[model samples]
Target: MAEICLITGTPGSGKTLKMVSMMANDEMFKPDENGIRRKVFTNIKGLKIPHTYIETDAKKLPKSTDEQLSAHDMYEWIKKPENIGSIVIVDEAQDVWPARSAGSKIPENVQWLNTHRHQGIDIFVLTQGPKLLDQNLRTLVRKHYHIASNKMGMRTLLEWKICADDPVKMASSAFSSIYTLDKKVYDLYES
Candidate 1:
């Protein structure tokens, strides 16, 4: 079964970069005959892996009917049995699956989150903070990757945290320590 992974950090902290790089390096996510590694909802580029890009403007209000269409489209695409083993990247996921504070639940997003893993659909959600994501969706994540910069230098660090408790708190507390250790520096161009 596929798993759900979350990449969270401050804006410009390289959360999306780490995710794109990891997916590009994974042999399982290599592009098919069409040169499409997976489906994406952001304009991210520079990775060697090619993917079908879906644009969803984050400026739109979360409750807007038009905004929900993107989530609906993604849900329909991944629900197909043929899409098993496929990967989907949703950047600025808060715009697609807004938190309870934003508005009511989005049924399409809810269904997709609950069933995508069983369908062998791997998902990568990129967000600035966990507080912006749906509470239920947060609980469903199998792994959380928190990226941050080191005060010691320009180098970046990555930490893998379990989603058992508060991810934001875990990431906040671990950021300082992650910078002090010999943590792996994720290269956006390399595996």
Candidate 2:
């Protein structure tokens, strides 16, 4: 099965840097014996890894205006049995969820992530303010990592753990931390 990793943090906490780094690692996207071609996105600046950058400014609509366009579109496109290796990374997932058409898209995106696991496509969503993201979406991450700013108050940290209960433990700080989401810890958020 494919893996889904979610990274969250406050502004300027290095979320984009991590997403770009993971996508750049050829090993992560290289196809296996099954024949999937991992594709990454590169913007005008030549940034690789097919990322759906969530725009926060009041301008053009991001391609990932909805889950169907981003996650579902990607799931369908990458499903070529031959296309065995591919993952979709969203930069600023929080923005992807509350825009014009994003309310429905957020939940659907979570569903797609759950249903498509191991089928072929994987997803990584990067966001700030985990508390602001859809609770359900936050619950579904297989791996959760975070980088806090001096502003990541105690309330924010506590809420993040309450929502995801991530396991792969890491030291907590206003700078960085990692959490594992094995099935055992997955249900901690069920209530």
Candidate 3:
């Protein structure tokens, strides 16, 4: 089953680092000793996950080897039928799915989450603010994480929050799972 996840952090925080490391180190995506890969996780992982960066118009990412897609191209690429079973991590989600404005029609991007089950698409979206995105999409998020860096010398703090289930209210949950992520994941992505 596919579920949308949201992560938020302040500018220069480890938000992008967390996003990259989470996917890079997930045991589920690690291939077997014989090099056999799990088809479910393999398909999307091989797709060279998309980001908002565009080649000519954007600055090169911290890592050069990882393939990237522009914000618009990413949607076109991910929505293709053959890309099913792809687990997508979206950076700068707020730009792609901006906050709902007065009398604006729900963009197809916001509506796309509902079809993830059928599309076999796994999404992990990162942004600076929770309310800064489409509520329709926030409603799909099962778990929310907030990252705070600069707590100690090379240490990162993480707060895992459970999304409130009520459809009418958008607020934080009482329960929070506290944990520490080695700022070492910092090497995978720069600040």
Candidate 4:
């Protein structure tokens, strides 16, 4: 079975930082930041492993882009793996195409990765705003990690709960109070 891990937070909440740090420090990663660079961990016995580093604009992924490479192609080069043990990291997932739009097509890059996620492919999806994602995509969040934010953004976890109207309001109000206090201190220090 495929496992989905969702890490959500506002900008500057250390979401990307956390992923980078994990990739850099994890034993399973093997530290392949550049796909073309000479393998750095080959000398360390049992460390030389197959991996890839795919770079793409999350906010502006071309629609209808497919995974297959072809002649006279006018699309972002699709990176396909020949073997197993691939790690895929998708940063800025919220900037990906919105699912609610009727005419917008899902980028083939994402679709391919999602298709292979179940087969020993570790996919890490880092997003900022959960509300922007469609119900179909949101349902894939099997594990969610929420960062501590004082003020709720356009959508908060409370909004997902049923019979939680009053509680959500109360939580938001309390959060605003705390956020205000923190902001005051920050401004005073910055000034």
Candidate 5:
């Protein structure tokens, strides 16, 4: 089944790198020997993976009032039954689904979020800041990877609370901490 996941952090904080690492090394994202990563649209490198992948270009969206409609259309095209075992990575998702705003395409996006699992389509979204993402979309996330940097090095967190009450503070703090969802916190180098 498809899983909805989010990767959030400040720009240059390794959000894209984390996604690329997962796609290149994580078993969950690996495909059969014959499978290949196909690009649906957009040009970001991490958004290209070894399964069905689609990157939405916010800049290319039509000037119509319902700008996000193109995203919805692209998503529908990517969800065909033939695309089973595919994964869609949306980089810089804030551009496609910004917080505190509703676009005409939101309903379709929300429906896809609610039903992609049944269709065997995994969706991984990345954003510069959690606060820039839609709250409703965040609620649908099954897993979250929060990346940050500190004096020690880069750190990743699976448990949201392990960071700090304020994401900005946690991201800007000088200490580096990394952990799996249920594992003890450890120095970033150990992972």
Candidate 6:
């Protein structure tokens, strides 16, 4: 019910665009018995959803067609046992969940990797360097997507690698889907 995915690319690679687009598709989710899927929480803003932004001290989110929470608040919010089937989008995950250090740097509210799988919460982490994210979470990554941008073509060549504990073959990929994301949708994220 839950899966861990990583998306990485250099500047202009549309990493944020990919995250928002995936979140856009999940807009139809609801929490009711019939709807079953209710809210999809993400750190991105200006989205077409009613999201209550949870910024630390100075946080605000859109309510019309978006719902959002800052990185710290997001991890804090999801730490609970609720929202078992919700989707969590953590952009700039390298900064949110940085690499391990010698000293203890664990925050009180930070959501560790274990909660997602056990509670059926799917998560997508976006970053520039694949190694930027915490290594503990790397082994559990089910899919890794990389995007390289193009101008005139406006066509992005992005592929997903089937990654887990043991690498699946070499130069391997489970899904080769190329998405043509309009930057206009990029504007969908509010400040």
Per-residue alpha-carbon lDDT of model 2 for 22-131, expressed as tens digits?
54443666566888556543221234334433233323432344232433334344555644455666666665443234444454434555565665667676666555
- Lowest lDDT 10-mer window, candidate 2? 182-191
Expressed as tens digits, the lDDT of each residue in 1-191 for candidate 1 is 77878877778776665675566456656777988655443435544455555545645423324223344356665565555666777778887776775466557757667777677777778888777888778878877766655555454454554442344456554433332221232343332
55-155 per-residue lDDT for model 5 (tens digits): 35546653223223345454465565565556667778876666766554465555566676666767677877677777667777766667655547646
Local lDDT at 112 for model 3: 67
The model with the greatest lDDT is 1
Alpha-carbon runs more than 4 Å astray in model 2: 31-37, 41-46, 49-85, 98-110, 149-191
Clashing pairs counted in every model: 0, 13, 1, 0, 0, 18
Among all windows of 10 consecutive residues in model 1, the one with the lowest summed lDDT is: 176-185
Write model 4 residue lDDT over 1-191, tens digit each, in one string: 44555656667665554454454555555644654422211111111233333324433433324442221111223333443444545556544434466556655544554454544555456566556555445665555554445445433332222111133334453222211122222221221
Q: Give me candidate 1's TM-score against the actual structure.
A: 0.68
Residue 36 Cα positional deviation in candidate 1, in Å, after optimal superposition: 9.3
Encode model 3's per-residue lDDT on 1-191: one tens digit a residue: 77787877667675666565675677645677999543332111223433233322234432223365544434455566656666666666766666787677866546667777777777777777777777787878877776544457353334444433331133233333343454556454443
Best by TM-score: 1
TM-score for candidate 3, please give it. Answer: 0.64
Greater TM-score among 3 and 6 belongs to 6
| CA-only RMSD, every prediction | 5.8, 10.4, 7.0, 11.2, 7.7, 6.1
